[PDB]
């Protein structure tokens, strides 16, 4: 019926100088690597790219740095793409950061017609209150800070207030497309393919398999056609897997792994971090079926895969491949971040640089030093969620981690619910600490010259843990 | 997995009086009839309820006022329900109308965590400015009325401000759900169960076809199954059909739809209101081929199918049953309006109840005499989308049905590009009205008396007609 | 410092296009040596935001006769033929602003505020958009209001209002020194304090001008630092518009010694022209009530004698006035956060139309009565208890009392009370109650004169002040 | 005769129940009700809530109520010389919830003026928009309550903070004048909050100085309309507390800093001088240079500090000192004088600091724990359009550096400053970061590089010039 087929350098050649792009992939899983490829051939120049990271080294996104064609990238994380990270410290490319939910809700409420919408995350970070350091000059200062957001009470809570993003073009990839451009994602490679084609003027497209019109289910497509406005059609290539993790010293992170968990209870749907979070699911008593959820689009989430189930489309959040149980279910990356805002995870267990008595959590960032980005971390805490925190007790240099107030820039105000450690476990009360568990037979007066805060020690059980 | 499966009768218990629900469905397009029935049975009331619709006479919500076990409706479309209708009238039932599109988003936000958001639909209506009659007494006046809606700048437009829903539960239906939740819709029976699944504090879903874990394809999944909280297997029953359509004196309607099928160009995506502007799907030009959009979950909608092909899953916005044309595509409600307050329509055509030079358009309302709600209008008008209105020049008692300013409450101010009647074609420019064609063939003479107002003539030509 | 110039040097300045603020309530505070001299040199498509557009030969209504101004934005035209005839024929756009909205915006200007919230405006026409600004040169439509946001405070919706900074702003003052400083009098005050904070240069207009230190510290009204230029114009008179002293159909009387009784001791009241202010009259017993003024004043006195009447003393209806002992002046920004801040015990009003729903239509009539909101939209948006005395039927025999308001709407559900020569109805859950009843007149007559349905359960008798 | 509102001050005090807000006028003690405050004392309401400027000084005013613990939770902008108020907010007995006060003033007024919020652009991107401050102590030293967020918008190009209204169950005020129908006339910087104080109250109570019949009172000359005012009081003549009676009868780089910030100012400038050195740059002017100085308690036009007999009570400035008045200068009341700083009516306000930086961030308000004084009227004069020029010592006690790269101690404003003056050398803020304009005496170069704390640009670099 209608046709949208073009070749990989025509459907790329409209694309001027200046041009605004949002770019599909949730680090390589989904990225359009043969167009943007194309896009190097033509010679674009400053380019202002929105995706949720940047490619990586020599791949998607991350090949367009190569001869200097980005002016600005708009992302959530930078993960291991070093180009990005040198060219923002020596002042080729401004690096303006946005949490990672926040950045799918945009570019859905700009293909919505939804101008601005609000939401708890980056609620009193530096995000919200302005000057991460978005520019530098080629010499060493500051050139640019990011401008602040609003901010609105809605119940007795604060919101921020995030504007709709509409970009000149939009670059998606998918496994399946007909020629009416209704595209069918495959695994968790969906992610941001799904809002990134709808916040876009011209929506280009590739496709690993091309099929006619009335060869895709109606019931099963993902992407509807009205969104695609050209489908092309690539030479097949094998995506770039990050890290191919499969099935086949220093822990005290098995300590605080088996602390955590006790933490799971039968019919939990939970979130868990990259380290120590997602060792306690290993620890897992016998019949306490519990979801993990990874923020990339997916619930029933497996352990890594064996050699013979290795699939590109299949990641987790820190990019390592990975299988899924039965009774699973993908999602994209604005129902993903829909689910998590929403509160509709049950346990939420993350690492930190810094926890404080508040509630605050400190990771995110430290300013000039670590500039890998928020990614996912500000929308897994600032949600309603109850929130666990999981880390060594002290840095290595004996200074305390648990502290009274923040430091180190925070990840989210107000969130954090548990502090386990191999040491203790607290629960934060009020905005105060209050020692709920301690290690076997320590003491409680070890535990006190360990953290640098006053807590409650009225009720001090020893800590338990799985086998 | 988990197993989330019930009773019909356990799963409804928890219901006490005063709850609020949000339910699935369009019309009886995915309507959880099998639970409102024992819904009916454990005998609830002081209800209030959030759904699209409200079913229709002794089926769905339809069955919870025959007992008055409902307070307040919150709905975008009465349809063909009388008991609803007449109870609104009466004193006995409260009424508030939302836009359907508004109506989805809502929900979504509140499954989102998103307390706020902007639209432009229904800015400059009376649900804007409030005062629709919500209540009556029992003797005939008025008792309540609609709160108005905040309103704010972005660029130079003004925007309505949207609160979130959340209800202390969610009725779904779907066709296929497995034992841990994850449900799969067919066809326009999906519309709002996604959006309502997401909303709710404990939702629960009628589903036709149970499946253990691992039946279901991850990548086929519309609700996943962590929103999912109890999934029941009613006793197999058959989905009401409103209007069984198949392919197998006096209407000038046809004069008015053979012009106004001239509108559709080629590659164009269109939207059809009920009634007038869809009985201009029959001429389309043999080279010319449209993709018709149904709001309740389609784009490539065929016209009414053979007696063997006839499925109750497949409706349009006038609940009559419907075909699919190859590379056609389904989608939930909170999507479907996603498209059109995007302004990926290229046309939108209406029917009207009157129309004005100002480019306003009245469609939805004359009070305590016709009450069938906004529906989609409010953001099929308010969107970028060019508006093509279709009526008969005067109405049922002589009067003009174009005029200077709306009598009747307004769907939507200055959306109107173009009105085509069997007398003459009108252009809207500059917030002013000119006549561009006349047809066969009453001159001027007799049109200018015809309308409710005088009008820009210079360049005049004929009104043609298509096959 | 010392700023004072000649008239013309201080004028020459402004350009084509440019943004001002006039002070003045009618022609009380109104600049006429100033805007005279904008005429003589000659400036083309002026915009002005002040509260009226002066009067025929006068103020800012001379600026009319070489069509001189492109937009007013003001809150009442009051006896201005050339502004209401240039508004129609469209040579002039027209912006209406309620009073209390306009004075505010400027002190919001002035200080930096840029923008604030009023439950004044809300529902009406003014908030929605659709006035007519500017008609076409046959009486079309060419622009419509642009609409004013709003947002929910606690239960109830107020406008967001934006702030107005001007080019310039022209004020009027009695008195005034070198370095800047002024002092008015009267009622003559109003928007000179807003206006001359707004402006970026401020030209002031004194009748007497001092040396820096013969002014009291503490009876400066507005400080030097916000004045720029001062001149000393040729003494002139202010035109008095209704030189008013103090030397048989009547159901006007009637209304009035029913509203009289309405008034309770300690009470601050704001009365409308007409009859609101012919109740004050028939006040039974000795003494007890203060009267407020919207232009600036509370203690209003009745007329004055011959030989004491006063230009900067005149009330809301731009007649002259008397003062009451313990009488207190203060500027238009203060006269009316005085109202919105629910101040007044009692405001009484006229209408042109009455709804059960609580609806007031007194403002406009579109494309047939150009007048504005004034005060009125502030004094009904505010907390206060709003009676209305009205006649009960128009001349013709159409009722004033209707179930919804026809015309644009001054304020949404805030009549308390409406008072007629045949009945006093209570507004009572958005709807009518009927309470009492004049003369002998039935309920059946009553019933038939007023346009809607209504509760008759406990029905007095009408009681009337001597 | 109309209206006779005269109430005596024990039958006036009786009303205010226990829990309720009261709002207090007065700047310092300058327009305290004092005698009003006593009788309160004396009934003895618990769990008071107060929203005034400061809280008195030890013994006078708000700081009388200090004694008996009968504050619940204090809303001000100044703590200012009084101990008592102070140790209890760190001991842990009152709630200490700062506001800048300008816009406690603008509150006060919106309250009673029936409008519910206005926007501002002080204090944004300021621990007092984004929350946590400390408000309450537990008994040992950790935070019980912190301050929570205001909300922002934008307008125009800039962030602007929403401030909520101020409205009271009763509100005390002190004036020089009042008649018997409650129209009340203030004298000297004595009116300052009282004027929005006696707006925003249910119940509002009026000490007068001197009570007069009505027709007394010039209409013209009423500075507070008689309908705001409930009831007054005719206490026993008092003696208004002068805190610093001023008059004219180590190293000091205090003076060089004051010399080089007079050749600041030029003709026609209207000025702000902040608490401390900024003060002292008035005495070294040229004489030829015709400045106003505007007092943010309520005047422009401030003198030196008068001759013996001319010393008033009613006339003093920020630091609470007693000031004389040129010709031609004029009183005016808080919300206005703040109107006029908020507005950027002011050509140049200078201020001291804890801390500046090179990106052009100021911190004068606060250190965590130690000096827990408030912004003042400091986070309105910085945010504003005028011009800031920052003086202060080069270091300070333990010869830490007082110029930084970016502020540790809590920021007064953001992106503020425009120059930094030192008795070593003068900084200009340039885009983000700091230039070296000049230096005193010959100085060395690399002597002031790493006793600064940061680089800079410093290519055209003059030696400095002191005012005679
Ligand atoms: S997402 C899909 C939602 N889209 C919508 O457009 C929803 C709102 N639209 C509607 O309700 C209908 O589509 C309308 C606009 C009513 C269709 O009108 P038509 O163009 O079909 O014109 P008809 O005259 O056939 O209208 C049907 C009934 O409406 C009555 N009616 C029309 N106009 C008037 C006026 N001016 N005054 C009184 N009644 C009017 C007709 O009498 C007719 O009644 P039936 O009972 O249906 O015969
Ligand atoms: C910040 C402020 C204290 C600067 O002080 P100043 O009066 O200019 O005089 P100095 O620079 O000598 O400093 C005064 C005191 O601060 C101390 N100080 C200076 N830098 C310091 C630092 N980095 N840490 C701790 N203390 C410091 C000084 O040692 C001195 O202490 P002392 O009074 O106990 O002897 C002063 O501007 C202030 O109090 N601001 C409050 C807000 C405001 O601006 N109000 C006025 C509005 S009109
Ligand atoms: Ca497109
Ligand atoms: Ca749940
Ligand atoms: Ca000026
Ligand atoms: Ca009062």
Same mark, same amino acid.
């Given at each position: 019926?209608?046709?949208?087929?073009?070749?990989?350098?025509?459907?790329?050649?409209?694309?001027?100088?200046?041009?605004?792009?949002?770019?599909?992939?949730?680090?390589?899983?989904?990225?359009?690597?043969?167009?943007?490829?194309?896009?190097?051939?033509?010679?674009?120049?400053?380019?202002?790219?929105?995706?949720?990271?940047?490619?990586? !080294?020599?791949?998607?996104?991350?090949?367009?740095?190569?001869?200097?064609?980005?002016? #600005?990238?708009?992302?959530?994380?930078?993960?291991?793409?070093?180009?990005?990270?040198?060219?923002?410290?020596?002042? !080729?490319?401004?690096?303006?950061?946005?949490?990672?939910?926040?950045?799918?809700?945009?570019?859905? &409420?700009?293909?919505?017609?939804?101008?601005?919408?609000?939401?708890?995350? &980056?609620?009193?970070?530096?995000?919200?209150?302005? +000057?991460?350091?978005?520019?530098? !000059?080629?010499?060493?200062?500051?050139?640019?800070?990011?401008?602040?957001?609003?901010?609105?009470?809605?119940?007795?809570?604060?919101?921020?207030?995030?504007?709709?993003? #509409?970009?000149?073009?939009?670059?998606?990839?998918?496994?399946?497309?007909?020629?009416?451009?209704?595209?069918?994602?495959?695994?968790?490679?969906?992610?941001?393919?799904?809002?990134?084609?709808?916040? +876009?003027?011209?929506?280009?497209?590739?496709?690993?398999?091309?099929?006619?019109?009335?060869?895709?289910?109606?019931?099963?497509?993902?992407?509807?056609?009205?969104?695609?406005?050209?489908?092309?059609?690539?030479?097949?290539?094998? $995506?770039?897997?990050?890290?191919?993790?499969?099935?086949?010293?220093?822990?005290?992170?098995?300590?605080?792994?088996?602390?955590?968990?006790?933490?799971?209870?039968?019919?939990?749907?939970?979130?868990?971090?990259?380290?120590?979070?997602?060792?306690?699911?290993?620890?897992?008593?016998?019949?306490?079926?519990?979801?993990?959820?990874?923020?990339?689009?997916?619930?029933?989430?497996?352990?890594?895969?064996?050699?013979?189930?290795?699939?590109?489309?299949?990641?987790?959040? +820190?990019?390592?491949?990975?299988?899924?149980?039965?009774?699973?279910?993908?999602?994209?990356?604005?129902?993903?971040?829909?689910?998590?805002?929403? +509160?509709?995870?049950?346990? $939420?267990?993350?690492?930190?640089?810094?926890?404080?008595?508040?509630?605050?959590?400190?990771?995110?960032?430290?300013?000039?030093?670590?500039? #890998?980005?928020?990614?996912?971390?500000?929308?897994?805490?600032?949600?309603?969620?109850?929130?666990?925190?999981?880390?060594?007790?002290?840095?290595?240099?004996?200074?305390?981690?648990?502290?009274?107030?923040?430091?180190?820039?925070?990840?989210?105000?107000?969130?954090?619910?548990?502090?386990?450690?191999?040491?203790?476990?607290?629960?934060?009360?009020?905005?105060?600490?209050?020692? #709920?568990?301690?290690?076997?037979?320590?003491?409680? !007066?070890?535990?006190?010259?360990?953290?640098?805060?006053?807590?409650?020690?009225?009720?001090?059980?020893?800590?338990?843990? &799985?086998?």
């Amino acid at each position: 019926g209608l046709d949208k087929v073009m070749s990989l350098s025509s459907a790329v050649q409209d694309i001027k100088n200046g041009a605004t792009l949002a770019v599909g992939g949730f680090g390589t899983g989904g990225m359009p690597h043969a167009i943007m490829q194309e896009i190097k051939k033509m010679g674009v120049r400053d380019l202002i790219i929105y995706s949720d990271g940047a490619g990586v !080294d020599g791949y998607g996104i991350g090949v367009l740095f190569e001869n200097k064609q980005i002016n #600005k990238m708009i992302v959530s994380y930078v993960g291991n793409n070093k180009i990005f990270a040198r060219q923002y410290l020596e002042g !080729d490319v401004e690096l303006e950061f946005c949490p990672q939910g926040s950045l799918a809700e945009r570019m859905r &409420a700009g293909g919505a017609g939804i101008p601005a919408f609000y939401t708890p995350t &980056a609620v009193g970070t530096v995000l919200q209150t302005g +000057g991460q350091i978005t520019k530098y !000059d080629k010499n060493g200062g500051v050139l640019k800070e990011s401008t602040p957001r609003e901010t609105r009470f809605f119940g007795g809570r604060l919101y921020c207030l995030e504007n709709a993003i #509409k970009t000149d073009f939009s670059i998606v990839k998918a496994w399946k497309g007909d020629r009416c451009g209704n595209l069918v994602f495959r695994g968790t490679a969906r992610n941001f393919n799904v809002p990134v084609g709808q916040c +876009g003027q011209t929506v280009i497209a590739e496709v690993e398999n091309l099929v006619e019109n009335g060869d895709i289910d109606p019931d099963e497509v993902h992407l509807p056609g009205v969104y695609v406005d050209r489908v092309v059609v690539p030479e097949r290539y094998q $995506t770039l897997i990050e890290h191919r993790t499969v099935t086949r010293g220093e822990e005290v992170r098995q300590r605080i792994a088996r602390r955590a968990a006790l933490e799971f209870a039968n019919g939990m749907y939970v979130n868990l971090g990259i380290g120590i979070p997602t060792e306690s699911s290993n620890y897992i008593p016998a019949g306490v079926n519990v979801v993990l959820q990874s923020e990339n689009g997916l619930i029933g989430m497996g352990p890594f895969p064996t050699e013979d189930k290795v699939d590109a489309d299949w990641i987790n959040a +820190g990019k390592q491949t990975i299988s899924h149980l039965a009774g699973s279910a993908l999602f994209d990356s604005a129902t993903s971040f829909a689910m998590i805002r929403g +509160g509709h995870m049950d346990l $939420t267990m993350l690492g930190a640089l810094e926890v404080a008595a508040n509630g605050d959590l400190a990771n995110f960032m430290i300013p000039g030093k670590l500039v #890998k980005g928020p990614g996912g971390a500000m929308d897994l805490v600032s949600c309603g969620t109850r929130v666990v925190v999981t880390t060594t007790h002290c840095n290595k240099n004996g200074d305390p981690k648990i502290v009274e107030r923040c430091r180190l820039p925070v990840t989210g105000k107000h969130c954090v619910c548990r502090i386990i450690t191999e040491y203790a476990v607290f629960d934060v009360v009020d905005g105060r600490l209050v020692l #709920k568990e301690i290690a076997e037979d320590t003491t409680v !007066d070890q535990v006190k010259k360990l953290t640098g805060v006053g807590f409650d020690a009225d009720n001090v059980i020893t800590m338990p843990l &799985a086998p």
